[PDB]
Amino acid sequence: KYDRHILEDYSREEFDELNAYIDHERDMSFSYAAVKQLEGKYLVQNRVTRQIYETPQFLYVLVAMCLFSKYPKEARLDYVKRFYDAVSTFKVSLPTPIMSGVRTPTRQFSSCVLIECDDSLDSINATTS
Amino acid sequence: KYDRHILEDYSREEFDELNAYIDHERDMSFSYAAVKQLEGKYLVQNRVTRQIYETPQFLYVLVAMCLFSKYPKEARLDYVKRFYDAVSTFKVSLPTPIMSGVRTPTRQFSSCVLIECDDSLDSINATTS
Numbered sequence: 001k002y003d004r005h006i007l008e009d010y011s012r013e014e015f016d017e018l019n020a021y022i023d024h025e026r027d028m029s030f031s032y033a034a035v036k037q038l039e040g041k042y043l044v045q046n047r048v049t050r051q052i053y054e055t056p057q058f059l060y061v062l063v064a065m066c067l068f069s070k071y072p073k074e075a076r077l078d079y080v081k082r083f084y085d086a087v088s089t090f091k092v093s094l095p096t097p098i099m100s101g102v103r104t105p106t107r108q109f110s111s112c113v114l115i116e117c118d119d120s121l122d123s124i125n126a127t128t129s
Numbered sequence: 130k131y132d133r134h135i136l137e138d139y140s141r142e143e144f145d146e147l148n149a150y151i152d153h154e155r156d157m158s159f160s161y162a163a164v165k166q167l168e169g170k171y172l173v174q175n176r177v178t179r180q181i182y183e184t185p186q187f188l189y190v191l192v193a194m195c196l197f198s199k200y201p202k203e204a205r206l207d208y209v210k211r212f213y214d215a216v217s218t219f220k221v222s223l224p225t226p227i228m229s230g231v232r233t234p235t236r237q238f239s240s241c242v243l244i245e246c247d248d249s250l251d252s253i254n255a256t257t258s
C-alpha cells in the first residue's frame with residue numbers, strides 16, 4: 001500500500017525520537033461530516049474489501065515525512081514538526097489528489113491538465129490516446 | 130483527380146497506337162442497375178459537386194494501364210489488351226476498393242483488416258488510434 005522507499009530514506013534511531021510528538025488525543029476533534037468522507041474515500045484502503053489499513057492521525061505525519069525525503073539530514077527532523085503542527089491544527093488544507101495519492105506507488109499528484117487539438121487526424125488520435 | 134505518374138511512365142508514341150483499340154461501341158451494353166450505382170459511387174467525381182470527370186469506357190483501360198507501370202517496356206503494350214478484353218467482356222469482376230480507388234493519389238487498396246487487443250491501457254489507446 002505504501003512506497004518501498006520511506007524506510008530506506010530515514011533512520012530507525014531518530015524514528016522513535018520523532019515518534020513521541022503525535023499523541024492521538026488531538027484525533028478527537030473531528031466532525032461527522034469529516035469522518036464520513038474520510039472513511040468514504042480519503043485514505044489508503046482496498047476499494048473492493050474496504051479493509052482500512054491506516055489511521056487519520058498517522059496520515060499527516062506520514063505525508064509530511066514522505067514529502068521531505070531529498071533533504072539534508074540536519075534539519076528535516078526539526079522541520080517536519082512545523083508542517084505537522086500546521087496540518088493537524090487545520091491551519092492548512094490539502095486536496096484529495098495530494099492526500100488520496102501520497103506515499104502511494106502510483107506517483108501522480110496533478111489536479112488539472114489542458115490539451116488542444118487542431119485540424120489533423122493524427123492529432124485527434126493522439127489526443128484521444 | 131489522377132496520380133501524377135502515369136504520363137511519366139509511358140510513351141506518347143505508343144499511346145495513340147494503343148488508343149485505336151477501345152471503340153466505345155461496347156459501352157452500349159449495360160443495365161440501368163449498373164449505370165445507377167456507377168453514377169452513384171464507382172468512378173472519380175467530386176463528392177460535393179457531382180461533376181463527373183470520367184467515362185465508364187476509359188475506366189477499364191486506365192486501371193489496366195496503371196496496374197502495369199513497373200514492367201519491361203517490351204510486352205506490356207501487348208499484355209494490357211488481354212486484361213482489357215477480360216474486364217470489358219464482363220469475364221472478370223473488380224470491387225469498389227480497387228475500382229473506387231485506382232489511379233488515385235490516396236494509394237489504399239485493401240478490403241479488410243484485423244486487430245486484437247489484450248489487457249493493457251496502452252494497447253487500447255493504440256488500437257483506438
Ligand SMILES: Nc1ncnc2c1ncn2[C@H]1C[C@H](O)[C@@H](COP(=O)(O)OP(=O)(O)OP(=O)(O)O)O1
Binds near residue numbers: 121
Ligand atoms: N476520411 C476523412 N474524410 C474527410 N474528412 C476527414 C476524414 N478523416 C478526418 N477528416 C476530417 C478531420 C481532419 O482534420 C480533416 C482533414 O484534414 P487532414 O487530417 O489533414 O487530412 P487531409 O490532409 O487529407 O485533408 P485536408 O487537406 O483538408 O487537411 O477532415
Ligand SMILES: Nc1ncnc2c1ncn2[C@H]1C[C@H](O)[C@@H](COP(=O)(O)OP(=O)(O)OP(=O)(O)O)O1
Binds near residue numbers: 251
Ligand atoms: N484506471 C483504471 N483502474 C482500474 N482498471 C483500469 C483502469 N484503466 C484501465 N483499466 C482496466 C483495463 C486494463 O487493461 C486493466 C488494468 O491493466 P493494466 O492496463 O496493465 O494496468 P495495471 O498494470 O496497473 O493493472 P494490472 O496489474 O491489473 O494489469 O484494467
Ligand SMILES: [Mg+2]
Ligand atoms: Mg491536411
Ligand SMILES: [Mg+2]
Ligand atoms: Mg498490468
